[PDB]
């Protein structure tokens, strides 16, 4: 398919950025889109044979490049907070429709006012209610990832070292801890439900795992709290007889 | 040090109508440092008794000031704003255009 | 041309879902195409057509004779069809206009819970207090917290596949020492 | 939302002795107070009717604060000269901005207190109102001094307490003007530019508060790339003005709509020529 | 109402 790089990225206001896309094998045309929260993808431009062939409603600070091997760059300078978006690349054949249009999964770019706006998640797991177990013979574990910014998290459950999906449900969107703040930190919850017997076996190991995409090695951290780098944060529990 | 050149807008409080009292504004913003000289001109001549707002500044720390005087516009009178600042080799003069 | 479509469509598992799209200004060199966007993914092709009904393994596409509208039909939806659906009118001419998206239609899919047994449970930290509202019916609406100190999530459905069992739940929590689960979701 | 914000400017003056200190305070886009150290008998001075009613104790206490502040900025400008190994021959500028935002619920949303030296960030109180961010190694000296003096706790007490209570008092005593948005008066003008082109200019006048959005659309598509916007500017009577202009082919004017978003408007506005 | 006076820089 289409390869887009990086999957996530944080920049501060005024910085510049280069996003990259390789088209699907057999495709030689690349179209870039900007998709802000709650909106549809907005067309930026389309490249074929190393040249910009058409452009949407975007200023020149948005520039592009296509190499001989058909891979492409989206370069944006003088970033604004409102440039935060999912940036999508779609590839196709010869500026036509006959081989389809295939989209990558996008680069999530968040532009923040200051590096100190970035916070990692705290992760805690809460063990199942004895009242639930008695009444239903099922046992729900709950995971909470809280205090993070921006919304650059992927949460997964792992049972005895293997990822599980059955019995799992994660909030489709996070809560704003302070809804009136434009840069509020976020909270996200997830649940894993298993049979009471499975929870009651102390051999079973349960982990809620949160991948956070934060600051890079190159970002200069001055604050006393830990640098909020890209990191994996987890909380866990063994079963209880 | 850090220096920022002044942006200048000249305009009237109300849409101009010839022969009707109005206020002539010269809004200077985005400059640094704060020392600045602003004159309003009528037919190339400095208007007297021009007042100005109190010094304030924006998020980016650059200053802004409003200079203003009452005037009754006419068909032939030409009005302008003359600004001097360390960032300006020569004074910048911006003519009043009632369509702007 | 250009497309307009509903903001949202609600549904239950197992029903047929139809999403209609309006495009009055479609031209002879325009085709119709639909894409779905799942959470954390790029848009994905579903189906395309010109004037005749189209059926594939994912959907059917209905196009009336004047081509001024079209209807995407999803045959027996499941939870995993929850996505945003985009109807696009595309230029058929090579090197013509790129694919332009309108606003999409958000499709929700609920499960008809058998033997609902709504209850609120208190859970304890493995190493802190969380309340769990679970097993309620899908018509239940979970109100957001009126207090700044209490956090209440929206509802989410989980599927315990090996048990043929589905259940809705929502979570509430607070750092306050007066916080009671009994009335958290009231 | 609502906010109270204070803006301090201190400027040294080689040879003219004491630096000039000027302070202005705002609620939202409305100035209410001024202090200028170069004035005949320096005093806090009202700039809005809803503090002119405040009695002499209020104004005496404000004046006493400004006078002490101006004395401290003289010391501050001298220390900064030492920190940056700068001469006495040049003029330098110390700025401070601080204040509080109230949420839509009337509760404290965010406090701030930050400083700049010669136009660049120097030190800022972080949003936790407990720790500092220094912009350079000179400001790191100030940070260590302020951590030792627990300066942040002093500022937090004002920002969380007094600042919010003053803002509430002002919002109530001036509710007729501070809590009543004045909608923009709008119209479109037309100026030929060539045989086949004409400028359409969308005007918004007399609105309060200053926040506004003006857009031109052709066929429902924003013409952002070819629209000239001026900065929002003060009318001089407490209201604001802005316009947006687009160059248009003679004959296609009916294809353009101007769209106005402002909080004094029940619905967004659409205008044409 | 203004803030009081704190520590010198
Ligand atoms: Mg902030
Ligand atoms: Mg099943």
Numbering used by the authors:
A (entry chain E): 6 to 246
B (entry chain B): 0 to 99
C (entry chain D): 5 to 131, 135 to 193
D (entry chain A): 2 to 274
E (entry chain C): 1 to 9
Sentences reproduced from the published study:
HLA-I molecules present short peptides on the cell surface of nucleated cells where they form ligands for receptors of the immune system including T cell receptors (TCRs) and natural killer (NK) cell receptors. HLA-C allotypes form two groups, C1 and C2, based on two dimorphic amino acid residues at positions 77 and 80. We compared TCR9a and TCR10 recognition of HLA-C*08:02 (C1) with that of HLA-C*05:01, a C2 allotype that is identical in sequence to HLA-C*08:02 apart from the C1/C2 defining residues at positions 77 and 80. Using HLA-C allotypes that differ only by the C1/C2-defining residues, we found that KRAS-G12D neoantigen-specific T cell receptors (TCRs) discriminated between C1 and C2 presenting the same KRAS-G12D peptides.
TCR9a adopted the same binding mode when in complex with C*05, as in the C*08 complex structure. TCR9a CDR2β Tyr48 and Glu49 coordinated peptide p7 Lys, while CDR3β of TCR9a E95 formed a salt bridge with C*05 Arg 69. All these contacts observed between TCR9a and the C2 HLA-C*05 are conserved in the structure of TCR9a complexed with C*08. Like the C1 HLA-C*08, the dimorphic residues 77 and 80 on the C2 HLA-C*05 also do not interact with TCR9a. The closest TCR residue to HLA-C position 77 or 80 is Glu 49 of the TCRβ chain that interacts with Lys p7 of the peptide but is greater than 7 Å away from HLA-C position 80. Position 77 is Ser in C*08 (C1) and Asn in C*05 (C2) and both form an h-bond of the same distance with the amide of the terminal peptide bond between pΩ and p8 (pΩ-1). Comparing the structures of C*05 and C*08, the HLA-C α1-helices were displaced relative to each other and peptide p8 was higher out of the PBG in C*05 compared to C*08. This displacement was measured by comparing the distance between the Cα of peptide p8 (Ser) with that of the Cβ of HLA-C position 77 (the first carbon of the position 77 side chain). Thus, the C1/C2 dimorphism impacts the position and orientation of the peptide at pΩ-1, suggesting that position 77 is the major determinant of the difference between C*05 and C*08.
